[PDB]
Symmetry: C3
């Protein structure tokens, strides 16, 4: 395993927007995609540049209670201070009892657990969230990578006319990481594209039973990811992604996946 | 692949009920079940017999932007007019990069994307939806087939005392296609019957891990299907299907699956 | 198969709390975990000790309409009376048509279907629910077993400060059975632990595609279960479990999974 040691900055970006970044002044919502391979360790020094108590907490990775990012376990970060969090991971292994301890690989995420409540309600509300991708040896890697977060009624905390436009060129391998947050229920749908409902979105063997889907529940705390080939079998153009809850899409949880020509040019019809 | 060429009519059935049909005056809610095998193409001339702008849009099948059924892509149908939509599909194939492009097979659906909003909110509300079943070579075929749509608080847009009664004879192979629509969350449950949670509802091989379930989330835009043997191991009788959200079932999202005797006669207890 | 014959008592425990128990005065919320192996039969004499009409109804097992626990099928229990319910199950078998009838194994549940409404709305509201675990030959068995029910805004009908603390020793095999009930949507999440999303939570073969997850939708009527090794790779301590819907966790759907030292002693940090 590789041990990586990074610094992340929690910053107030603007009114009611807080985010994580890899350099001072660099915070974004969603935060940076953090990538690991099974067995790797990530040591993160979280620098809290804000006037608020907040934290950093992951899903799916191995962390002990001192790294859990909760007030209860003394894992939060006071204003101006720095806390080291350690996230480990593992390849699968055989247990003494003969069962299999599964490797960490998956599309996971990280977020605030301390701001405004012991569940991080205000931190999550205001943007402290990002994707954590743990890969298995041999996995295919993307040309383009998009994080889509349905947070209450917002996509990536954008204003309601502002939903993110994600862009790829026809034929490129594109990875989507979907994360739900907040208090509302949602279904994430992508026009013109589909994926297998399993870890990677692609068939692992001849025996894989997983259904092909174009839509999946994305409720608070849930994450999943997949890869598609942009425009495969469907061509270039402006391809909608949206929450399929009708009241939600009508209020603006809908955005565009723009698939350009293979050469990067804008498709004629647009 | 087979290329089929059909005409579908969008019609106002009654006050606040719009549907699709395969012949003039023949519209139903839900609309006709459209069936394809992987590799087949369906060319649909949608005749809009109404005074409203509306469209036809699928999930899961290969369509280009000109067939997407959206206003944005110039794919809707003006009152009185006809639009040709083309839906393709494919068997699985090996990509140059060594991954597997999955075949289209699945329980999918189609609906309006243009009426009242660019998300088809009014069209879906009023009944323009139906099942689209794409089969894999070798799949088992049903004796009876039911489409169950949980649309907001309605089942198949029926009045609240009117939920559909579906009927089969003991021992028959019965296919259920479940579709969610609207703004509300639901869980679809069938008394006395169960299916494997995978594409077909049945074990694909000795290695299939899929759990056996009797209930599944059915939220807006989501579809799934399965087959069961009517009354298998449980006998004939009146077998409830319902949304398991308590407030919903109490307000009428519950209906009956009547399993008759093998010979079609009514079971004694009823 | 083993045929077991038991008596269960439906009792009013306190104001607005009704539960099932295996002996007079022994009712609990959730009720007792009932365990079967595929092929076993359970005959239950339900003694209704209350002043209310109520019933007992399962998911997943084979029962005929006379055992369905509904008023419609004459399956409820009048105050003071006793009704025999018969629940069967089966190992998988090959059908004449060549398909496979799947064995009953799964994490299922039972609850009231007759109290206050024909859907058992009041009975479920007030605590008549419990886990039903049907095992496959060869399955691993737990040292500790917890039933977690998200019922409307309550966990196991506890007062909002009272969410259950579940305890295990480091390294023990722990089984969780999760059940949703009521009218609200939820996502069940466990800090520091993870499981494969399939029947048992553990890899069934080299070909199992199932993703590793730490959180899953738990909506009304839905059940699932899994096993984990307490503190595996993460150590002992106080490990939160919670609904990840932010408004819910903040109002108290959160509780503790206390992982003690291997020897049963309290970890230092606590
Ligand atoms: Cu948490
Ligand atoms: Cu939504
Ligand atoms: Cu669509
Ligand atoms: Cu979380
Ligand atoms: Cu759409
Ligand atoms: Cu419902
Ligand atoms: Cu039931
Ligand atoms: Cu749709
Ligand atoms: Cu029921
Ligand atoms: Cu909840
Ligand atoms: Cu967590
Ligand atoms: Cu139930
Ligand atoms: Ni505006
Ligand atoms: Ni009425
Ligand atoms: Ni209080």
């Amino acid at each position: 395993g590789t041990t990586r040691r990074i610094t992340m900055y929690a910053e107030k970006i603007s009114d009611e927007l807080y985010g994580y970044g890899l350099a001072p002044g660099g915070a974004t919502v969603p935060g940076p995609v953090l990538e690991m391979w099974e067995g790797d360790t990530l040591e993160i020094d979280l620098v809290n540049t804000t006037d608020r108590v907040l934290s950093l907490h992951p899903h799916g990775v191995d962390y002990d209670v001192n790294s859990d990012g909760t007030l209860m376990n003394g894992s939060a970060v006071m204003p101006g201070q720095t806390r080291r969090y350690t996230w480990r991971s593992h390849v699968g292994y055989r247990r003494a009892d003969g069962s299999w301890a599964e490797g960490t690989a998956g599309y996971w995420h990280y977020h605030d657990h301390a701001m405004g409540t012991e569940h991080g309600t205000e931190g999550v509300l205001k943007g402290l969230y990002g994707a954590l991708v743990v890969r298995r040896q041999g996995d295919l890697l993307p040309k383009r990578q998009f994080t889509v977060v349905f947070n209450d009624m917002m996509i990536n905390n954008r204003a309601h006319h502002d939903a993110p436009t994600f862009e790829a060129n026809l034929g490129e391998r594109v990875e989507w990481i979907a994360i739900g947050h907040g208090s509302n229920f949602h279904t994430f749908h992508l026009h013109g594209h589909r994926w297998l409902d399993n870890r990677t979105g692609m068939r692992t063997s001849e025996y894989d039973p997983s259904p092909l889907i174009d839509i999946k529940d994305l409720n608070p705390g849930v994450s999943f990811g997949f890869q598609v080939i942009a425009g495969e079998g469907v061509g270039p153009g402006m391809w909608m992604y949206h929450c399929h809850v009708q009241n939600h899409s009508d209020m603006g949880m809908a955005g565009m996946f723009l698939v350009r020509n293979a050469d990067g040019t804008m498709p004629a019809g647009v």
